[PDB]
Design a protein around this ligand. Sequence first.
Ligand SMILES: *[C@@H]1O[C@H](CO)[C@@H](O)[C@H](O)[C@H]1NC(C)=O
Ligand SMILES: [Sr+2]
Ligand SMILES: [Sr+2]
Ligand SMILES: [Sr+2]
Ligand SMILES: [Sr+2]
Ligand SMILES: [Sr+2]
Ligand SMILES: [Sr+2]
Ligand SMILES: [Sr+2]
Ligand SMILES: [Sr+2]
Length: 145
Amino acid sequence: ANKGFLEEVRKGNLERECLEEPCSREEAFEALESLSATDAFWAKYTACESARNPREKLNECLEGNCAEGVGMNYRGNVSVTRSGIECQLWRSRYPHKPEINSTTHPGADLRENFCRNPDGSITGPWCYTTSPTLRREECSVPVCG
Ligand SMILES: *[C@@H]1O[C@H](CO)[C@@H](O)[C@H](O)[C@H]1NC(C)=O
Ligand SMILES: [Sr+2]
Ligand SMILES: [Sr+2]
Ligand SMILES: [Sr+2]
Ligand SMILES: [Sr+2]
Ligand SMILES: [Sr+2]
Ligand SMILES: [Sr+2]
Ligand SMILES: [Sr+2]
Ligand SMILES: [Sr+2]
């Protein structure tokens, strides 16, 4: 957190610098090493600033199974929509070409055909659908607590 005074002369540490204190991306970055690791992190972090306290609710929100807020932190496995349709490969370009991928929103675990919300859309974690008919649509992901 930089509570000043030769604290930056010591090894980076995630518990202590970011889980235990609020942190700058540069603090994570120093504590995490790899940057791909720092993109994923930040993304989870930044979607969990609304649930930083208790520090038990933060562990729930970073875990990724439940959705908090509009669930930009959802990192779970639900893959079929609200209508029941099944999601498209974010990787895939058919039947609809995604405009958000990995290149665009990389903190965001766009793995498989999983529900995600790179975008923080108001109606929650969603995905691209199979139906040539319907492009994208909300998913029914569990809510945190
Ligand atoms: C979206 O990501 C794919 C990789 O799967 C890439 O080939 C495509 O060019 C990207 N589209 C945009 C963001 O340019
Ligand atoms: Sr620090
Ligand atoms: Sr500190
Ligand atoms: Sr540091
Ligand atoms: Sr601790
Ligand atoms: Sr401290
Ligand atoms: Sr630095
Ligand atoms: Sr520093
Ligand atoms: Sr370092």
